[PDB]
Amino acid sequence: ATTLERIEKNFVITDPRLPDNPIIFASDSFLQLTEYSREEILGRNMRFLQGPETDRATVRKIRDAIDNQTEVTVQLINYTKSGKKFWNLFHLQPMRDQKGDVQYFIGVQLDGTEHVRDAAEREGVMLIKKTAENIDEAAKELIKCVVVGDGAVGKTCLLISYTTNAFPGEYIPTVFDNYSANVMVDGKPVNLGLWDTAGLEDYDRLRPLSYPQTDVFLICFSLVSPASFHHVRAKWYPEVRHHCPNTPIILVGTKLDLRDDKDTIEKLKEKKLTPITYPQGLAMAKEIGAVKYLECSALTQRGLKTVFDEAIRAVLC
Ligand SMILES: Nc1nc2c(ncn2[C@@H]2O[C@H](COP(=O)(O)OP(=O)(O)OP(=O)(O)O)[C@@H](O)[C@H]2O)c(=O)[nH]1
Ligand SMILES: Cc1cc2nc3c(=O)[nH]c(=O)nc-3n(C[C@H](O)[C@H](O)[C@H](O)COP(=O)(O)O)c2cc1C
Ligand SMILES: [Cl-]
Ligand SMILES: [Cl-]
Ligand SMILES: [Mg+2]
């Protein structure tokens, strides 16, 4: 099996365990075909491709196949971001884990300007079905990394900084969201899927939908919020272990850039607090049996690449 980025076809992978079956991977060709950015697609349901002339009866066949966890192939009109119409010969199929449970849906698009029939149709179907099988094999190697921790500790910024090299402005709390990265490890490409989650306690009942089949967890806390730090021990570590007793945990200290920041130190001082020190983070890591303690700053990117490199290594090496 190859890796996912080496499959030059239109396709996406969704996670049906999460609310509304969001896209967790999209190929470059798909993004090109549809004119969306990866940022606009991941974390969302693909229904946005549908439009005025889309046959809603055909859409129901898709919904029905998904609900029954079976494969289906149909042709329907879809639309690009700019409203450009195209015909979509679409194949969907479940990817199952060892215990035969559905883990993902794979979806393959073969685009054209017409509704193909007879021989052309038959050829089209055999083609996308073969592609689907290739994806299934490649997807078995997708590494699942789940990112948890208090609200506002910087889980999302960390993911955006790493995958886009930009830093976000406004703080927007997360429900669920997904990111992907292709990372060189020891000279070989690795596909890394990142599951962003909600820090707020009112999401305690939803959050664990992300947990099954997780390869490595990032438990995050802010180096300049001691409360987020103690919650590592009191909340996140127990929650993670409760669902995933054997999954490796990497402890991540965030906002490294603020630990030596004048104004931040002063504000903490006014609260009768001080920043979390490396030895303190290390000690927490040891206490919860984390395989690595790592500090980083989404803003400056210091220690950022190392976080995801080590995430992968905790799984593969
Ligand atoms: N100085 C500095 N500020 C950061 C850094 N990372 C995040 N922040 C700030 O902290 C705020 C919270 O960032 P988020 O990444 O959205 O926090 P989160 O953990 O994803 O929060 P929830 O989605 O609610 O669980 C951001 O708006 C930034 O202003 C960092 O590396 N350095
Ligand atoms: C793997 C995956 C790929 C999908 N690809 C498409 C697509 O190419 N075009 C499209 O119109 N819908 C696609 N969908 C179908 C929609 O996401 C959605 O399930 C369909 O609209 C029925 O859902 P709804 O009735 O709740 O909107 C895809 C779904 C999944 C599971
Ligand atoms: Cl903070
Ligand atoms: Cl820094
Ligand atoms: Mg967030």
From Swiss-Prot:
**Residues that, per the record, bind GTP:** 151-157, 170-171, 173-174, 198-199, 255, 257-258, 297-299
Annotated tissue distribution: Isoform B is predominantly identified in skin and epithelial tissues from the intestinal tract. Its expression is elevated in colorectal tumors at various stages of neoplastic progression, as compared to their respective adjacent tissues.
A single GO cellular-component term from the record reads:
cytoskeleton
Regulation of its function:
Regulated by guanine nucleotide exchange factors (GEFs) which promote the exchange of bound GDP for free GTP, GTPase activating proteins (GAPs) which increase the GTP hydrolysis activity, and GDP dissociation inhibitors which inhibit the dissociation of the nucleotide from the GTPase. GTP hydrolysis is stimulated by ARHGAP30.
Query: In the UniProt annotation, what is the result of changing residue 171 to F?
Result: Abolishes AMPylation by Haemophilus IbpA
SMART domains under this entry?
RAB, RAS, RHO
Can you name the source organism? Answer: Homo sapiens
Which PANTHER family does the record cross-reference, listed alphabetically?
RHO FAMILY GTPASE
| GO BP, sorted A to Z | actin cytoskeleton organization; actin filament organization; actin filament polymerization; anatomical structure arrangement; anatomical structure morphogenesis; angiotensin-activated signaling pathway involved in heart process; auditory receptor cell morphogenesis; cell adhesion
Protein name per UniProt: Ras-related C3 botulinum toxin substrate 1
Q: How does it assemble?
A: Interacts with NISCH. Interacts with PIP5K1A. Interacts with the GTP-bound form of RAB7A. Interacts with SRGAP2. Interacts with CYFIP1/SRA-1. Interacts with PLXNB3. Interacts with ARHGDIA; the interaction is induced by SEMA5A, mediated through PLXNB3 and inactivates and stabilizes RAC1. Interacts (GTP-bound form preferentially) with PKN2 (via the REM repeats); the interaction stimulates autophosphorylation and phosphorylation of PKN2. Interacts with the GEF proteins PREX1, RASGRF2, FARP1, FARP2, DOCK1, DOCK2 and DOCK7, which promote the exchange between GDP and GTP, and therefore activate it.
UniProt membrane topology term: Lipid-anchor
Instruction: State what changing residue 209 to A does.
Output: Strongly reduced interaction with PLCB2
> Known post-translational modifications?
GTP-bound active form is ubiquitinated at Lys-286 by HACE1, leading to its degradation by the proteasome.
Sites bearing Phosphoserine, chain numbering = 210
Q: Which domain of life is it from?
A: Eukaryota
Q: What is the effect of changing residue 203 to D?
A: In MRD48; increased substrate adhesion-dependent cell spreading; constitutively active
The gene is RAC1
Recorded domain comment: The effector region mediates interaction with DEF6.
Annotated glycan sites: 171, 174
Q: Which UniProt keywords apply?
A: Cell membrane, Cell projection, Cytoplasm, Disease variant, Glycoprotein, GTP-binding, Hydrolase, Intellectual disability, Isopeptide bond, Lipoprotein, Membrane, Methylation, Nucleotide-binding, Nucleus, Palmitate, Phosphoprotein, Prenylation, Synapse, Ubl conjugation
Taxonomy, top ranks, is: Eukaryota, Metazoa, Chordata, Craniata, Vertebrata
Location within or outside the cell: Cell membrane; Melanosome; Cytoplasm; Cell projection, Lamellipodium
What's the impact of mutating residue 156 to N? Constitutively inactivated. Abolishes interaction with PARD6 proteins. No effect on NR3C2 transcriptional activity. No interaction with PPP5C. Doesn't activate PPP5C phosphatase activity and translocate PPP5C to the plasma membrane
